[PDB]
Amino acid sequence: AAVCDICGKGPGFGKSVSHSHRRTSRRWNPNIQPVRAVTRPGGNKQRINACTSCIKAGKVSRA
Amino acid sequence: MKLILTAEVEHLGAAGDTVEVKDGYGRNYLLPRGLAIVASRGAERQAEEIRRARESKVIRDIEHANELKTALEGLGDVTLSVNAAGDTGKLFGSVTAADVVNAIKKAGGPNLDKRTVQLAKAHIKSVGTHPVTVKLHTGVEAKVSLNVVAQ
RNA sequence: GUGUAAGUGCACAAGGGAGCUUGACUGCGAGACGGACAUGUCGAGCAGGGACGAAAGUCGGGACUAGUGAUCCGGCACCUCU
RNA sequence: CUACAACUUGGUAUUGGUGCUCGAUACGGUUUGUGUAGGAUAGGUGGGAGACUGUGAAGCUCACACGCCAGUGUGGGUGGAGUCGUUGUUGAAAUACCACUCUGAUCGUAUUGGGCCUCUAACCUCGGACCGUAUAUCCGGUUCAGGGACAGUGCCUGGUGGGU
RNA sequence: CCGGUGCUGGAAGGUUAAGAGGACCCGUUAACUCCCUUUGGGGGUGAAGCGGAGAAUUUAAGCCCCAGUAAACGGCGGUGGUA
RNA sequence: ACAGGCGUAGUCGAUGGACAACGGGUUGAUAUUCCCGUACCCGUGUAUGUGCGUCCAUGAUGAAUCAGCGGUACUAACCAUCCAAAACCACCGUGACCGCACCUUUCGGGGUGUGGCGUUGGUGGGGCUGCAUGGGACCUUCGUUGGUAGUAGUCAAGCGAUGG
RNA sequence: UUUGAAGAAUGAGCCUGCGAGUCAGGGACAUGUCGCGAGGUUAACCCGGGUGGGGUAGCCGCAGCGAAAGCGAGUCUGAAUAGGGCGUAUCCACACAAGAGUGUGUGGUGUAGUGGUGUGUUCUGGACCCGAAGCGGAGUGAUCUACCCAUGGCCAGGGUGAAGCGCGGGUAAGACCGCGUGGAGGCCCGAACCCACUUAGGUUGAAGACUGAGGGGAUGAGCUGUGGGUAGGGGUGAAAGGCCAA
RNA sequence: GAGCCCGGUACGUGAAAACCCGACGUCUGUCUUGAUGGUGUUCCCGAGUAGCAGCGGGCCCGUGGAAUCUGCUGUGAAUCUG
RNA sequence: GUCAACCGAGCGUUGAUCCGAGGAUGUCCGAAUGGGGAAACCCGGCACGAGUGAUGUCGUGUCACCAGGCGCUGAAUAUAUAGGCGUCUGGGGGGAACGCGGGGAAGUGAAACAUCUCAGUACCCGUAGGAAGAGAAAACAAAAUGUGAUUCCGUGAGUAGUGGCGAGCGAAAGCGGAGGAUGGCUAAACCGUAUGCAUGUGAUACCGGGUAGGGGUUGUGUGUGCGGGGUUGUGGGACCUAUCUU
């Protein structure tokens, strides 16, 4: 739920900064949604994980 | 998300209209179900929309029509012209469901779509005469003889 | 008796009263006191512009010594700086 | 003291349709305007010497509204040929007519969001049934049956937080 | 004994984040409007665009608030006289 | 995120299940192992008969069909039914709201709605009929009986499971 | 090491080996010595089997004051020639004003730095040497011990006598009471087995936790073999901060 | 304690075969169905990208007036007077 | 051969022992790969041989998983997909340092400590190469008619700055050098062609002129592939249109 099967997005790593400026490690996870990909318009759906960026760009077809 | 309607959808428009709609609507309801196409290029989409609207209304079938189509499929053979080498007897290109459908419509008369013709089961990647089964309905089927003539 | 603790002072008054007024200033300051350093204290006098006084003159807060907080960071106003 | 895990709140993305229901601005309009000199509840204004009329006015019987119960606007029937102009007032003329219009209540055209009832296609099911499959309570696929644009999960955000 | 601290239940108000909203103000300059000198510089207004800070209106839980709870953590007082 | 975490099909894992040897003697050292006597358990080949079969033939006569009956049987529907699908009505209760009744705060307010509806809703009623439910049972399908050839199948030694 | 130790304060049994201010950098300051000297010098790099030759990019000195614009032997503050601050290497002569400490002018004298390198301190480095309890990263461990899972094994001997059932009494049936069979139990006494309450010995031991006498349980929440599992801020814990290879 | 005893040094010589560097050709591809210089307009010049916003990373720069580079979530443009 | 000799035996001028280069053999474990496993030891299948009267037995091959091609097949299910087959090529593991991209502490200094430092260090992960990374301006610069890809040294500089402005941290422009390739190729707009999906007023349309024939370079679209076309900042290139032309 952090690596897209199409674009290979990865979770960015960073430091959460508090009011007292205490740096604590954390990650920025991609918005990766479960999608039923229809590779061929015939209509056999396969289950994959695709980032919300790839859905918007139309890289996966839900037919 | 701008898309061109193919059929008529209530509260949205009629065929040929270009509408902008929420991307959730087009991706999950209209485009997958074939009720519209993406509005990307006027020369293509308008011509494609016209062809789609006529094709859907002209390829429809009912239970009574399926029985009538079953009898109408009793005509003679249908010939296919394909590019091939006469020395071997095997085809260069591959016969596609549109090629079979376009052959029957222009010669026989019945109007069918690619969705029903069973082609891979007959293994017609050769030269000769092969029988092709056509499923017009869940219970009703039909058989059409196919003769293939090489280039 | 001296606004206020104690001491040093003050009757020549620094104590009591009256009239005017804002020096409870600006730019400086020879020479010093005291100090590890950082602070702290006195300063005659010069210039500008004033107050009281006829004038000489006095006035850069209060009889004196306590009533206060370095630096960093930031606020406000002015400047002929970048 | 300062943080973090975990739990929790809301916004947004994945996330869609029809309905009511509002709230804002834009549009096609009406409505209302209690200084006095008065035909009198004086819009300021530009066109202003002529407009509404029988595709049916003055005058009455009623409906509804606001009401400062001073009266207006309006629907119908009735009626039938007028109300009207500098008409003299007044800084300001006509309720003769035309153009945007504001103090303010209204409806239909747009947009925007808010709340609510719904629907199925996103999404979910450790619910059933078939297939891969000889063996499989795994897994995936087709289909049926239920939820359903909620929940889950990203990003932003307020809480609780000796649990570390 | 339900005041304290928890837990459970209820929001009519008050406070309250992000996200929505962008009134007003400022930076810049098209165009002007004044000028002062003699081989171009000094004051004011300043539309549109692009920006900087941004207010009013909105908004959830929580907390403030009202009840119940002690086989919940807990509490179960002093002084004077008086046959 | 990467590293890796689980796990299906299988494949390992005795401390367990299944499986056929006992007594005597001998060397300087081994013996249920060697030797002596007598057994047991898996396979292979040869030969001898017994000994049933496949073709051949025996038994192979006899099973399937054509139809009828008689109702499984979607279909339409009926006998219709468990519940009350859904609305109906009312009583109670009161969503808001409207004057007012009450508690009222000492008296007034003010809220509530003890009121009007109505519906936060609840409770009950009967029908509307629905829900699902079969059957009786119709085509269909099949069982039985009546023929259709003791005629077409079948069928016979022996092995026989990875399956029950 | 102490105000003070022969000290009854610390250390050393003896001998022989070994064992503690070093190095890097064009670093900083100071001080010697050498080269050049209003100049000194190269770094990187190139050419030479070398230690030699080239290399002007830079650095230091050569003018200061001021926040800065800027000005310049002056400059800043300031309304000020009006004082002050910093500066004009220093010295000498002469004049002019003061004797609130000397000042201003003219003239002469003229300004010394920079490259190696020796030494002392110092900067960044472990920086004179030796020494913790503990902190983080990655791994190894349940063959000892705690708990659990699968499958086996063991518990001499002797007592007490539950329920049930039967007989008799009892009754209307009961309740219940006596006598027979039966043999239950986190039951009893007691060896194997498992523990560890008291005492004595051991205490440079036989043993880094034992021995001798007595002692508790000993058919159960029992003891034990085999194979397996749980791992460090974690496990396990009939709970003591115990156990996780003395 | 060796230039003159030995192995060697100075200086020369040595490759059948394998490998490595070159070099000359077979071979491969390309230009010649082609180039040079001139005039006035429409089309093209890398898209879920650039830009903006929220939270971070990193740059001398510790969020500061915070530019340029970059990660995740949203929003999301122009094709040269760009 | 050797510690390392002693015995017994032999080879060598017909060239031994030795040294170099290429071959053959190379048991078993190990990525270990037929299955299994407690690494180096158990059990096999298939084909071809060898061997017994036949089972037993012995050799030579071959049999793992995954990825990618290729051909057949296409479940529930209809198109078809998953999947199943057969076959060819690849991976997997090791290595001292150097590279690149990720994750990333604590002791320590701050005379405490959280911001900060230690440090993007130690360690971990994924990956190549003989080197890697970077590289041909959406760059610097500052009005000079300047530089002209990247990388690596020396300076700039412990400066500008940054910092609980604390401890500390710390550039770039420019200038001097090493190397020479200020190197190359694409995508778009246009054409031609091959297609796949559509359709067709299926005709007056598709090619430059004219003559005529025709009814498909489909009439029109579109997407994909392939050949020309173009690679530029004084903007370049496509279309258009003038002059010469090996």
Q: Indicate the residue among B43, B58, B73 that finishes a domain.
A: B58
Residue B14, token pair as written in the block: 């009629």
**Experimental approach:** cryo-EM
Same domain, B49 and B27: yes
The spacing between the Cα labelled CA in A16 and the C1' in G134, in angstroms, equals 30
CB neighbour list of residue B6: distance below 8 Å, 6 or more residues apart: B15, B34, B35, B36, B37, B49, B52, B53, B56
Same domain, B35 and B86: no
CB neighbour list of residue B33: distance below 8 Å, 6 or more residues apart: none
**Is the CB of A62 less than 8 angstroms away from the CB of B23?**
no
Evaluate whether residue B150 is within a structural domain: no
Contact B103, B79 (CB under 8 A): yes
Residue of B27, B33, B38 to mutate when probing chain A, most A C-beta within 10 A: B27
Evaluate whether residue B34 is within a structural domain: yes
Rounded to an integer, what distance in angstroms lies between the CA atom of residue B56 and that of residue B12? 19
The spacing between the Cα labelled CA in A23 and the C1' in G130, in angstroms, equals 40
Q: Indicate the residue among B41, B58, B75 that finishes a domain.
A: B58
Give CA separation, B105 vs A8, B93, B127, B131, in Å. 47, 21, 22, 17
Q: Resolution to 1 decimal, in Å?
A: 3.6
